UniProtKB/Swiss-Prot annotation:
Monomer. Interacts with OAZ1 and OAZ3; this interaction disrupts the interaction between the antizyme and ODC1. Keywords: Nucleus, Polyamine biosynthesis, Ubl conjugation. Expressed during testis development. This is Antizyme inhibitor 1. CDD domains: PLPDE_III_ODC_like_AZI. GO terms for biological process: negative regulation of protein catabolic process; polyamine biosynthetic process; polyamine metabolic process; positive regulation of polyamine transmembrane transport. PROSITE patterns: ODR_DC_2_2 (PS00879). It comes from Mus musculus.
């Protein structure tokens, strides 16, 4: 696998790259494609490091496990949070060491635990006694973070139940080393982080009474990507860390950003393959069984230069595959392209029976200017960047 990365100067932008690939795809098969700005990921990481230099991020692989993304974040210095064996195996295959991997699945299966012990991944979260006994039985070197719930699916245990889990762990001989919590992005009620940190210090207090050595705090993945959202969270947690979890306590603070890094770095272009007048219904060449899976649980722009209520459906035509129930479009025709921005998270899925084994092409770009900065930080020289080939864009 080689990633060819087109370098852009100061005269060319993402609208130009899209126009170029829409021209080439026209002209050829006419597949959906993504464009990935890899310098936007590198900028997300130096944003992290400016605002919260002491919190080490562990990338949530499930957000986007495309190997060019994982290799860039590895070369920038992230850890990785994995929620299956095959996520852990993909990260180890790229050369990440097991000490930079945490196993965060809320329902761990015995063979995932025993896989983790077999490959040396020791750090894992736990919120319940039955998972605790699975870990004890199958992983003798496990280092466990107790996962506390947060009032913002939802995971994590109550504070009352953590006293009991600590007693069980002592009896089962599990090393508890820390606490984890998570707050939703969408929770603009930043005070929830106060009660979370207070609950965590309470667990680090009780666990020290039991004889555990607590040295890791994970504050979760509630980061959208924007500088302002990250600076809001920092404004709330920073004084409480300064105080409950100071410099020199030897307590390492980590987070699990995912969408933070990739969501706004990728843009998707799809074409219209069918058209039905009811108001118009348009069928596109990508759908819920490909890049728009997240619809099951971001505004279309017309690519070409009187508006009707329109729906967009994917290419399966099946009842689940309605991607935009109604928006206002011009009347478009088969073969016309629609462009969706902020398509980097929960979208890079594998070819499968359900998409007839087809997935969009992926094209990568960076500004010369973001590249110069990687060069000057020493990262383009790292063996973790060996598969990337950077050249002035056509």
């Amino acid at each position: 696998a080689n990633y060819s990365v087109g370098l852009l100067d100061e005269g060319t932008n993402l609208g130009n790259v899209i126009d170029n690939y829409v021209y080439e795809h026209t002209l050829t098969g006419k597949n959906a494609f993504f464009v990935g700005d890899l310098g936007k990921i590198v900028k997300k990481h130096s944003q992290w490091q400016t605002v919260v230099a002491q919190i080490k991020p562990f990338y949530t692989v499930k957000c986007n496990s495309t190997p060019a993304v994982l290799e860039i974040l590895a070369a920038l210095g992230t850890g990785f949070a994995c929620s299956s064996k095959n996520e852990m195996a993909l990260v180890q295959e790229l050369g990440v060491s097991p000490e930079n991997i945490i196993f965060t699945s809320p329902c761990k299966q015995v063979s995932q635990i025993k896989y983790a012990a077999k490959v040396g991944v020791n750090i894992m979260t736990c919120d319940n006694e039955i998972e605790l006994k699975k870990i004890a039985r199958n992983h003798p070197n496990a280092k466990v973070l107790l996962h506390i719930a947060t009032e913002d699916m939802k995971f994590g245990t109550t504070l009352k139940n953590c006293r009991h889990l600590l007693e069980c762990a002592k009896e089962l001989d599990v090393q508890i080393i820390g606490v984890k919590f998570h707050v939703s992005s969408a929770c603009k009620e930043y005070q929830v982080y106060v009660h979370a940190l207070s609950d965590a210090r309470c667990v680090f207090d009780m666990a020290g009474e039991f004889g555990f050595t607590m040295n890791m705090l994970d504050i979760g993945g509630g980061f959208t990507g924007t500088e302002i959202q990250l600076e809001e969270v920092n404004h709330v947690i920073s004084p409480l860390l300064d105080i409950y979890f100071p410099e020199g306590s030897g307590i390492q603070i980590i987070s699990e950003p995912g969408s933070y890094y990739v969501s706004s770095a990728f843009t998707l272009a799809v074409n219209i393959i069918a058209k039905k007048v009811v108001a118009f219904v348009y069928y596109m060449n990508d759908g819920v069984y490909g890049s728009f899976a997240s619809k099951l649980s971001t505004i279309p722009e017309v690519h070409k230069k009187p508006l009707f209520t329109s729906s967009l459906w994917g290419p399966s035509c099946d009842e689940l595959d309605q991607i935009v129930e109604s928006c206002l479009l011009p009347e478009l025709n088969v073969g016309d392209w629609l462009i969706f921005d902020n398509m980097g998270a929960d979208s890079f899925h594998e070819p499968s029976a359900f998409n007839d084994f087809q997935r969009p092409a992926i094209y990568f770009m960076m500004s010369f200017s973001d590249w110069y900065e990687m060069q000057d930080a020493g990262i383009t020289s790292d063996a973790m960047m060996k598969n990337f080939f950077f050249a002035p864009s056509c």
